[PDB]
């Protein structure tokens, strides 16, 4: 009785949303990508194209026509719209990857709730909010789940599927199936702050910052230590810059707000200062380290 | 007056004579006494020997030492098959040469008078370590450096068992020692720069990358790794997610070679619990070192991880 997700609406053409769209389309799903303006959408779809093209040139060297066909077919199955309500009437799944603001998300989902078909599942890619809070902005909590991806979406194979206590098993299973259909590996977590990955990763990153701040070791030695001592692909400072200092701070800020006594979520002066100076990591050319 | 003095000192310090001299006073660690024939000490002895250092491996009886060295031989024979897949003779020579430079003695005091470096990798008990080092202090050559591989004690606490604190440091390796290319070199406030540089140099001579950390609990790696492993256990114990899913999440989500439960089994549940217990005892109010019932239970059952064929998971 569970739905097979075929037609997917992705809301938000940022890095995450565009990545989700790309992979869904690359795996035979029909995709409608939604954002605020045509200029934003054009840029998102262009980014998807370049990302697909890069892959194709490498993978289809011995068969360039197949490569071109793959890219073109994939892009073709990504439609765009600046009006979410107009596209969800018979979509199977909405995945929201927009600004991390409860009010904005709820306003979105409350509206979509009215226009989406009954069978439509709603999922949020949010890293900052409890799915439950967003789900209750609708009357379809049984069809509301967390579907949490990782940057870069076309590379990262994990998806966290998050049930609230109200999510149906049917909805959960549809999302597990959808995740596998994307070529990904779904794991399950309760609707708890940080789910699995961020819950275990982000506080560690904060601890690396705190160790540096105490004067105990250099950022460089800490990065080296984790790479050579723990086999991590990136040192925590490299990784902080890679995932975004603003992105990190915001998540920890949120955790700190809800649990101000918790040592793990104590703000970092160093992190705060970099974000205040708009040094956000790799994406601004400077975070803890300088890039160029 | 003082500005003049510092100026004279600086110009002297950059002079050919002073630079040649300082260079000439450097004592390269060539002879190493490794104390403890367990996984860590044997591994340290193995790498030191494989990289051209002369080693004495020390433990309590000949049988223990024979068995430790047998383990080293077996590890070297594996290295040899990889180094020289197509030449058994070259492999044999490597193994024999390496093994031959590892001597064994039951009393470290008998050899330290002519060693350059003692690396202690014995039981994590301050009293035992201190008894050891206070005694070796009497026998060791003046230039001899003392280092501990301890994961649960402050270097400073051990250093003060001796009167050579300027020549005492932490030198912290990772299992498997021959494979893991990191060494944490730990200065206490008393460790000299001479001692520190000799150990940095020794670390590189082992084919490893030394990093520096203050003599703080957990140094770098464990300080950042172990509390994360405890958090993973806690998330599981909360019932928020299964061990299997958490492992998958960290491998696929964070690119970790092993998820935290497999890694816990890998590094040892008893090993882990012992470290965190120490942290908990020292900082009882601290939430992060709160004992884990699951971890405690497994350790109580002698389910220590991969080394006993069962920890969080069952092996073999």
Swiss-Prot record, chain A:
Q: Which InterPro entries match?
A: 3-OHacyl-CoA_DH, 3-OHacyl-CoA_DH_CS, 3-OHacyl-CoA_DH_NAD-bd, 3HC_DH_C, 6-PGluconate_DH-like_C_sf, 6PGD_dom2, Mito_3-hydroxyacyl-CoA_DH, NAD(P)-bd_dom_sf
Q: Which reaction does it catalyse?
A: a (3S)-3-hydroxyacyl-CoA + NAD(+) = a 3-oxoacyl-CoA + NADH + H(+); (3S)-3-hydroxybutanoyl-CoA + NAD(+) = acetoacetyl-CoA + NADH + H(+); (3S)-hydroxydecanoyl-CoA + NAD(+) = 3-oxodecanoyl-CoA + NADH + H(+); (3S)-hydroxyhexadecanoyl-CoA + NAD(+) = 3-oxohexadecanoyl-CoA + NADH + H(+)
Q: Which GO terms describe its molecular function?
A: 3-hydroxyacyl-CoA dehydrogenase activity; identical protein binding; NAD+ binding; transferase activity
Residue positions binding NAD(+): 12-17, 35, 100, 105, 127, 151, 283
Q: Where exactly is the site Important for catalytic activity? A: 148
N6-succinyllysine sites (modified residues): 58-59, 65, 114, 163, 170, 180, 184, 190, 219, 290
Residues bearing PTM N6-(2-hydroxyisobutyryl)lysine: 105
Reported modifications of this chain? Succinylation at Lys-59, adjacent to a coenzyme A binding site. Desuccinylated by SIRT5.
Q: Which Gene3D superfamilies match?
A: N-(1-d-carboxylethyl)-l-norvaline Dehydrogenase, domain 2, NAD(P)-binding Rossmann-like Domain
Set out the biological process GO terms recorded for this chain's protein.
cell differentiation; fatty acid beta-oxidation; negative regulation of insulin secretion; positive regulation of cold-induced thermogenesis; regulation of insulin secretion; response to activity; response to insulin; response to xenobiotic stimulus
- Its main localization is mitochondrion
Q: Which UniProt keywords apply?
A: Acetylation, Differentiation, Disease variant, Fatty acid metabolism, Hydroxylation, Lipid metabolism, Mitochondrion, NAD, Oxidoreductase, Spermatogenesis, Transferase, Transit peptide
Q: What does this protein do?
A: Mitochondrial fatty acid beta-oxidation enzyme that catalyzes the third step of the beta-oxidation cycle for medium and short-chain 3-hydroxy fatty acyl-CoAs (C4 to C10). Plays a role in the control of insulin secretion by inhibiting the activation of glutamate dehydrogenase 1 (GLUD1), an enzyme that has an important role in regulating amino acid-induced insulin secretion. Plays a role in the maintenance of normal spermatogenesis through the reduction of fatty acid accumulation in the testes.
The entry sums up its family as follows: Belongs to the 3-hydroxyacyl-CoA dehydrogenase family.
| Self-association state and partner proteins as the record states | Homodimer. Interacts with GLUD1; this interaction inhibits the activation of glutamate dehydrogenase 1 (GLUD1).
Q: Mind telling me what this protein is named?
A: Hydroxyacyl-coenzyme A dehydrogenase, mitochondrial
**Protein source organism:** Homo sapiens
Swiss-Prot record, chain B:
Metabolic or biological pathway:
Lipid metabolism; fatty acid beta-oxidation
- Residues given in the record as NAD(+) binding sites: 36-41, 59, 124, 129, 151, 175, 307
* Residue(s) at site: Important for catalytic activity: 172
Give any GO molecular function from the UniProt entry.
NAD+ binding
Principal subcellular localization? mitochondrion
Q: Does the keyword Transit peptide apply?
A: yes
What does UniProt give as the signal peptide span? none
Q: Name one GO cellular component term.
A: nucleoplasm
Enzyme class, UniProt record, top EC level = oxidoreductase
Residues with PTM N6-acetyllysine: 83, 89, 127, 138, 181, 187, 194, 204, 214, 243, 314
Q: What is the similarity comment for this entry?
A: Belongs to the 3-hydroxyacyl-CoA dehydrogenase family.
Protein name, please?
Hydroxyacyl-coenzyme A dehydrogenase, mitochondrial
Recorded source organism is: Homo sapiens (Human)
> What phylogenetic lineage does the species belong to?
Eukaryota, Metazoa, Chordata, Craniata, Vertebrata
């Amino acid at each position: 009785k569970k739905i097979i997700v075929k037609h997917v609406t992705v809301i938000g053409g940022g890095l995450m949303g565009a990545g989700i769209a790309q992979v869904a389309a690359a795996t035979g799903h029909t995709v409608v990508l939604v954002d605020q303006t045509e200029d934003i959408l054009a840029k998102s779809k262009k980014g998807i194209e370049e990302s697909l093209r890069k892959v194709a040139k490498k993978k289809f060297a011995e068969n360039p026509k197949a490569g071109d066909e793959f890219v073109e077919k994939t892009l073709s199955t990504i439609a765009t719209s600046t009006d979410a309500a107009s596209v969800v009437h018979s979509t199977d799944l909405v995945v929201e990857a927009i600004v991390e603001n409860l009010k904005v998300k709820n306003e979105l989902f409350k509206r979509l709730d009215k226009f989406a078909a009954e069978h439509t599942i709603f999922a949020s890619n949010t890293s900052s909010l409890q799915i439950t809070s967003i789900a209750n902005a609708t009357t379809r909590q049984d069809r509301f789940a967390g579907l949490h991806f990782f940057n870069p979406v076309p590379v990262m194979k994990l998806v966290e599927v998050i049930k609230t206590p109200m999510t149906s098993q049917k909805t959960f299973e549809s999302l597990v199936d959808f995740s596998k259909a994307l070529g990904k590996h779904p794991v399950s977590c309760k609707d708890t702050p940080g789910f699995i990955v961020n819950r275990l990763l982000v506080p560690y990153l904060m601890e690396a910052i705190r160790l540096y701040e105490r004067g105990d070791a250099s950022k460089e030695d800490i990065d080296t230590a984790m790479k050579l001592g723990a086999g991590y692909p990136m040192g925590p400072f490299e990784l902080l810059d890679y995932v975004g200092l603003d992105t990190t701070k915001f998540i920890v800020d949120g955790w700190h707000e809800m649990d101000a006594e918790n040592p793990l979520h104590q703000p970092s002066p160093s992190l705060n200062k970099l974000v205040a100076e708009n040094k956000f990591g790799k994406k601004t050319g400077e975070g803890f380290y300088k890039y160029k």
